[PDB]
Design a protein around this ligand. Structure first.
Ligand SMILES: COc1ccc2c(c1O)C(=O)c1c3c(cc(O)c1C2=O)[C@@]12O[C@@]1([C@@H](C)O)[C@H](C#C/C=C\C#C[C@H]2O)N3
Ligand SMILES: COc1ccc2c(c1O)C(=O)c1c3c(cc(O)c1C2=O)[C@@]12O[C@@]1([C@@H](C)O)[C@H](C#C/C=C\C#C[C@H]2O)N3
Lengths: 121, 121
């Protein structure tokens, strides 16, 4: 058996890192974990408070153009309240809709990366 | 404040899903959470055992070509041993090398998605 415990982090491709930081921290409500020099540019790391797995807002992977990410799903304890919050902050939300795997909504970040919300049923 | 608790899952773009399943489950040692029909294709979902954030091995997002993912980092309690295991299992590993944040190695899946391993200090 391997010693891997969890995904530490994964990358979200953005163009303007300042606008992305402000979106994920101020609109989506993530904590800012780090904003410092990194190997290939500015290292900008964000996550929901208390979560094991964090997100890195990157602009240095040519195979990942800005706004190209899909299939990212965030667990929420209150999808309905979260959607209303997003709308009040000027975000176009699609949903929420009941699905077989919880009540879900989606929206986009400033670059067009698609973020999902899911509250299991 | 938003009610988001954590990333439930994110997507990794693959071509042959049966090949990716056996790589992630048998070679990398992840748990197979689910393998069933989904709305856009075969839903194939894997995770390090007991981890909150899982990975979905997908083939249906045009903006994410198979093998295009980078900047994925897995946390491990023993990077040296995991690398020895991967090599034994027929996988090329770059590293491990010490870094400012911990001791890290990288390898690629059958499509060319790049996966990091990190043992923090
Ligand atoms: C609290 O822990 C950390 C603090 C800072 C860093 C890192 C930390 O783990 C870090 O892992 C890191 C880094 C990489 C570059 C970095 O600049 C960092 C960090 O700055 C990369 O080696 C990668 C690679 C597997 O993608 C890999 C991961 C990644 C995601 C995007 C990238 C880029 C590589 O340059 N690791
Ligand atoms: C153990 O819980 C689950 C079991 C099965 C599924 C899902 C589960 O959460 C599921 O969330 C799901 C689904 C979507 C399609 C699915 O087929 C599923 C599932 O089959 C999608 O709506 C997406 C969307 C945000 O991309 C969103 C998520 C995602 C990642 C890739 C995708 C695709 C959409 O087709 N949600």
């Amino acid at each position: 058996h391997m010693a891997i415990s969890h995904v530490q982090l994964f990358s979200v491709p953005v163009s303007d890192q300042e606008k992305a930081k402000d979106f994920y921290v101020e609109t989506v409500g993530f904590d800012l974990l780090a904003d410092q020099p990194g190997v290939h540019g500015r290292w900008l790391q964000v996550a929901p408070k208390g979560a094991d797995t964090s997100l890195v807002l990157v602009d240095w992977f040519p195979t990942m153009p800005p706004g190209s990410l899909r299939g990212l799903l965030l667990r929420t304890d209150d999808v309905d309240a979260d959607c209303a919050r997003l709308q009040e902050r000027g975000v176009a939300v699609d949903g929420p809709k009941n699905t077989p795997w919880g009540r879900q909504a989606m929206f986009s970040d400033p670059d067009g990366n698609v973020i999902g919300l899911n509250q299991p049923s």
